From Swiss-Prot:
Name used for this protein in its record: Phenylalanine-4-hydroxylase
Residues bound to Fe cation: 132, 137, 178
High-level lineage: Bacteria, Pseudomonadati, Pseudomonadota, Betaproteobacteria, Neisseriales
Gene3D superfamilies membership: Aromatic amino acid hydroxylase (1.10.800.10)
Pathway membership: Amino-acid degradation; L-phenylalanine degradation; acetoacetate and fumarate from L-phenylalanine: step 1/6
InterPro entries in alphabetical order: ArAA_hydroxylase, ArAA_hydroxylase_Fe/CU_BS, ArAA_hydroxylase_sf, Aro-AA_hydroxylase_C_sf, Aromatic-AA_hydroxylase_C, Phe-4-hydroxylase_mono
Named cofactor requirement(s): Fe(2+)
Any single GO BP term: L-phenylalanine catabolic process
Recorded catalytic activity of this chain's protein: (6R)-L-erythro-5,6,7,8-tetrahydrobiopterin + L-phenylalanine + O2 = (4aS,6R)-4a-hydroxy-L-erythro-5,6,7,8-tetrahydrobiopterin + L-tyrosine
Domain of life assignment: Bacteria
Encoding gene, per UniProt annotation: phhA
The keyword Iron belongs to this UniProt entry's keyword annotation: yes
Top EC category: oxidoreductase
Amino acid sequence: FVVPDITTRKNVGLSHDANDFTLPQPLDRYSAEDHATWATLYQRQCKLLPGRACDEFLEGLERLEVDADRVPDFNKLNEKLMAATGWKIVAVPGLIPDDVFFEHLANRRFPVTWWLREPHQLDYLQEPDVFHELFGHVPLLINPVFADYLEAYGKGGVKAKALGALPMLARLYWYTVEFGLINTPAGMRIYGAGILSSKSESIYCLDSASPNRVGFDLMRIMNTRYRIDTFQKTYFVIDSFKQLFDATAPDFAPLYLQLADAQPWGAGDIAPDDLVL
Ligand SMILES: [Co+2]
């Protein structure tokens, strides 16, 4: 039997803008259970993440006043975010078209799935939900260097789509924004949103001998496959958010055409020129 997925179930009776796929955050659809599930996830992650999350992430939660006890009001968070970096979050039903996603980031709008997992899925949800996309992705948007990286990333969507290279950018996003690590003199820390919202990946990614930790390299990353249904076999490590922003400076067009005919690295591969940490 095929049954409707969570995105479909949650958006029953709702709509979205035809062009940008946004809707006003539907605050009336959040139940008591939703606020309680949010509070449980927030409390869980805030216990796990000290000494694991990069300091900027934890500071961003505080500066944006991300609610600990309820699903945040996007408009209220935006007052803080706009003043900091001119960014805002916009509500979306779930997955949106790539060109729209990129156009959002290019215009300093960060799309956030509005709905939350059910408490029976506290441990993990495959689909991005509002906990992953707000708690995991948004706090670093008050960092002007990271925000500028996302903007530059967004702006690259037009050229990438024109050249059939959106999957090459998707790899860059995955291995930075979603699953990136940042080395510090205090030790390795986490900036990837997919790790920051996870129950257990933040333990594995710093404590396990199993995954590879490889220095950031743009071409390597854009030539590396990923999988969505398992902990990462490889994490890419930056020294600074400036490294990400600066990586967007050159013309990606000739990089895409070179990659197009190449065989990609497997998710668990170490490449001959990797700086292995
Ligand atoms: Co994400």
